[PDB]
């Protein structure tokens, strides 16, 4: 007893070999190695041709494609002078504010983002042939469609990554499915006469794709599963981190607009995006692995990992799935800490780097909504200062649009709230987006959704308060300067209508005290929350408000109604008897020398066309570009411009001095 | 305000099943969720179920195996059934809306604003 | 499942005076959560208080609603002869709706 020693003879090659492997000694300085245990793993005195029939069960690649790939560069050199900060040890004397340089220690931060420890490659059956039993520190993204009867798990580690698809027929003889990525010299430990190249599918200069499967499993998953995976390995190694988050995150963002995830087919795309999830996720991990006792600076981890947790919230909206793992407390202290450093409420005065930076570690130090709402306050701080600075009706610049993405997750997360204590601030925020989308912005997004471009992931009309936005004037919105082909058009003005379904919890009110006062809900057209009151403008009368004006339409063209409601509180009932007529007013001077109009909204409409455009003056500068531009043509008798006030009144500005 | 108008039975047998219909005016089905609220003389004010304008249901949990809710959106009508009826099943039926919209799944309840004019069923041999 | 024991269960006053409702819980629940109710004999419930505070459209500010917790109520002053009627609380947190026994209020003469 008392296992001591074996020693291993080699007669290859002439010359004898003879070597000495003490296990009393390698064993009580590796802990977690159990000699025994893989040697029953082995099958040591299995037969060959017993060893042979196990060696044919699995499915071998028939070809192997050799593609050379680069491989990019994700981590920068440590910026000088850059405070290191241990994951471990983060106290509020670790670093001042958003602009000292910071980086954090890469050993400790993987310490605590594979923090788990578990098995990856279990005794199940298609694994138990061709690998080892390995226990590794580990984390895993896990989901599930059809009732368990699909069922897709993203183990990783530090080194590799293995996604594994489980499908039951309902009747019996489950279906098993893996794909290892990751470094051709950091694959897992094979068993038996399995050799790696006969079993990968793509593979570079250091990366490979393995699939583990057999004949029988491989065969049956080929009816509904053919993936591209050159393609695939080629976005894996060739793309940096927050590229391949983001190419992903815009993947799913696209599935679950147009109504894709709500009934989740077993399609090839569909599986390829999870397998993609669990890339996404491993890259991060495996890019501060191999930096090993070095730091990372904070703002590649800011980035990285606000699109890690945009994906995981994505993720656990579309088939709910679980992200275990890729998630240092110690980054969140530092994002949460610094967070404390800058005041919300003038985000937006400084410089756009800044603010997406801050903007970044708002979500990754506080990832869940409702411990910190004042995180709202900093995005509309910064969408009010981008809307003082942005052209009237132009379509998002792509920096624009990128921060004002970025930012607009924490409004995301507090619209889906059930009760909130930033309700104004939400009103604002979505006030100032009614006002970003108009008819060039629709135009764009529309174009970009079917073009498949970056315009079409976010638009402030995704969480403006328009509700006039049906198909038939999206397709009159819809560019056609460029050479569309009338199908990624017809799919884009879908998936752009369904984005707007009020059925998404962030899309419906629930936070406009004043949504409540009206009773045909299928009729309103847009909601405009100012200071002291808010117009509910609809193509209805029935709305219990403090007034009720009517505009001037053509005959027999869906009239329109503004009814103001003051301090968002309902009337009793709706104001009967002759709607009042909108007063013109021609003697306002184009001169002003101080902004008379702050606070007011200008809304321009069309007789036959409908609403048309919608502008917040919140600041001398804009009411001087609406005043001394363009924007006023009296020419055109169709058009109607409309002056919104803070007591509830509604004028028609129909001259000017 | 919105106005209901229901219609149903007034005596009905025990073994029998109660079926009754309101129709809103004045408004819109879409966007909120409208329940039927019974009440024995004297005692009451009992929830039985609610409905929205696309057909999503939630019923009393002591109820739920006898009552059924369906909803017509061209007429702007919600219909109520309940069946294996019982003489303490006799009531004055309302039918009210939620004082404000819900329009998406993951929403808690709302109060009710308005209430409609109950309606006497008498379950009697 | 949440049930709300109301108290008291009848009550007369005079014109002018303050009448006290309360309404207990069995359980916790949020005050975003609770309804006031009155209903004249032979009419429709008409909403009184939403919110366990907030005041509904028409109710002038002699109805006032307050607690939190398990404990609720509704205060009506200055009473008036129209103010008649049985008063309910309801609470719409839980998965089924709840009321009370109710509260039958007579204005002396």
């Known amino acids: 007893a008392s296992l001591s020693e074996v020693k291993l003879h080699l007669d290859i090659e002439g010359h004898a070999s003879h070597y000495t492997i003490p296990w009393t000694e390698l064993m009580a300085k590796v802990p977690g190695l159990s000699p025994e245990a893989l040697w029953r793993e082995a099958n040591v005195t299995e037969d060959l041709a017993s060893m042979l029939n196990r060696y044919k069960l699995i499915y071998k690649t028939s070809g192997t494609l050799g593609i050379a790939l680069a491989e990019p560069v994700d981590i920068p050199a440590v910026s000088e002078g850059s405070m290191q900060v241990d994951a471990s040890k983060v106290h509020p004397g670790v670093i001042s504010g958003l602009n000292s340089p910071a980086c954090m220690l890469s050993a400790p931060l993987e310490k605590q983002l594979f923090y788990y420890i578990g098995t990856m490659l279990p005794n199940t059956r298609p694994h138990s042939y061709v690998f080892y039993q390995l226990r590794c520190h580990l984390s895993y993204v896990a989901l599930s469609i059809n009732g368990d009867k699909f069922q897709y798990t993203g183990a990783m580690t530090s080194k590799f990554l293995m996604g594994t698809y489980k499908r039951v027929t309902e009747k019996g003889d489950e279906h098993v499915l893996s794909l290892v990525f990751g470094k051709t010299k950091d694959l897992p430990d094979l068993r038996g006469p399995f050799s790696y190249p006969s079993l990968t599918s793509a593979q570079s200069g250091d990366y490979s794709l393995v699939i583990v499967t057999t004949f029988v499993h491989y065969a049956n998953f080929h009816n509904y599963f053919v993936p591209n995976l050159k393609d695939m390995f080629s976005r894996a190694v060739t793309m940096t981190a927050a590229s391949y988050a983001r190419y992903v995150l815009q993947k799913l963002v696209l599935l679950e607009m147009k109504g894709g995830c709500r009934e989740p087919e077993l399609d090839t795309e569909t599986l390829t995006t999870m397998f993609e999830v669990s890339v996404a996720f491993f890259k991060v991990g495996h890019a501060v692995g191999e930096t090993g006792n070095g730091c990372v600076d904070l703002r590649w981890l800011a980035k990285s990992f606000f699109e890690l947790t945009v994906l995981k919230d994505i993720i656990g909206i579309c088939y709910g799935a679980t992200v275990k793992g890729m998630q240092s407390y110690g980054l969140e202290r530092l994002a949460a800490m610094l967070m404390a450093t800058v005041k919300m409420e003038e985000l937006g005065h400084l410089t756009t780097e800044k603010q997406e930076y801050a903007l970044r570690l708002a979500t990754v130090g506080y990832p869940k909504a409702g411990v910190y709402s004042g995180l709202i306050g900093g995005a509309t701080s910064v969408l009010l200062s981008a809307y003082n600075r942005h052209p009237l009706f132009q379509p998002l610049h792509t920096v624009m649009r990128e921060t004002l993405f970025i930012g607009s997750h924490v409004v995301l997360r507090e619209l889906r709230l059930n009760v909130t204590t930033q309700g104004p601030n939400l009103a604002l925020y979505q006030l100032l987006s009614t006002a970003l989308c108009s008819a060039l912005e629709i135009g764009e997004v529309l174009r970009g959704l079917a073009l498949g471009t970056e315009s079409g992931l976010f638009s402030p009309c995704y969480l403006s308060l328009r509700f006039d936005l049906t198909r038939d004037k999206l397709l009159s919105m819809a560019p056609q300067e460029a050479t569309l082909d009338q199908a990624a058009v017809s799919n884009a003005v879908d998936g752009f209508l369904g984005r707007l379904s009020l059925e998404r919890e962030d899309r419906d009110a629930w936070h406009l005290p004043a949504y409540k006062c009206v009773d045909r809900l299928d009729k309103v057209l847009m909601i405009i929350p100012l200071i002291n009151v808010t117009f509910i403008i609809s193509s209805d009368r029935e709305v219990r408000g403090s007034a009720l004006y009517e505009a001037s339409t053509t005959y027999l063209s869906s009239s329109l109604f503004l009814s103001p409601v003051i301090m968002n509180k309902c009337s009793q009932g709706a104001v009967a008897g002759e709607p009042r007529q909108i007063p013109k007013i021609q003697n306002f001077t184009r001169t002003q020398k101080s902004c008379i109009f702050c606070g007011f909204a200008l809304l321009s409409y069309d007789e036959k066309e409908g609403l048309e455009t919608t502008t917040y003056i919140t600041s001398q500068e804009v009411q001087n570009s609406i005043l001394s531009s363009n924007y006023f043509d009296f020419d055109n008798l169709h058009v109607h411009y409309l002056l919104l006030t803070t007591n509830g009144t509604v004028m028609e500005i129909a001259g000017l001095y | 305000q919105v106005q209901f108008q229901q219609w149903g039975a007034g005596l009905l047998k025990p073994s029998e099943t109660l079926s009754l219909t309101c129709g809103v005016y004045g408004g819109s089905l879409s966007g909120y969720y409208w329940s039927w609220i019974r009440q024995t003389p004297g005692k009451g004010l009992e929830w039985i179920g609610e409905i929205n304008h696309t057909g999503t249901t939630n019923y009393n949990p002591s109820l739920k195996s006898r009552v059924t809710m369906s909803v017509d959106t061209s007429k702007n009508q919600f219909s109520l059934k309940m069946s294996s009826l019982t003489a303490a099943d006799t009531a004055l039926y309302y039918c009210?809306?939620?004082?404000?919209?819900?329009?998406?799944?993951?929403?808690?309840?709302?109060?009710?604003?308005?209430w409609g004019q109950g309606t006497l069923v008498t379950v009697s041999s | 499942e949440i049930v709300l024991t109301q108290s008291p269960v009848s009550l007369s006053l005079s014109p002018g005076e303050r009448a006290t409702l309360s309404c207990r819980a069995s359980q916790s629940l949020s005050s975003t959560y609770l309804a006031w109710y009155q209903q004249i004999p032979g009419q429709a419930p008409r909403l009184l208080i939403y919110g366990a505070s907030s005041r509904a459209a028409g109710i002038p500010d002699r109805f006032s609603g307050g607690g939190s917790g398990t404990d609720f109520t509704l205060t009506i002053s200055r009473l008036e002869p129209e103010d008649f009627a049985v008063y309910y609380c309801?609470?719409?947190?839980?998965?089924?709706?709840?009321f009370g026994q109710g509260t039958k209020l007579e204005i002396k003469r």
């Open positions: 009210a809306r939620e004082g404000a919209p819900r329009w998406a799944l993951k929403r808690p309840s709302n109060w009710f604003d308005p």
């Open positions: 309801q609470q719409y947190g839980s998965s089924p709706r709840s």
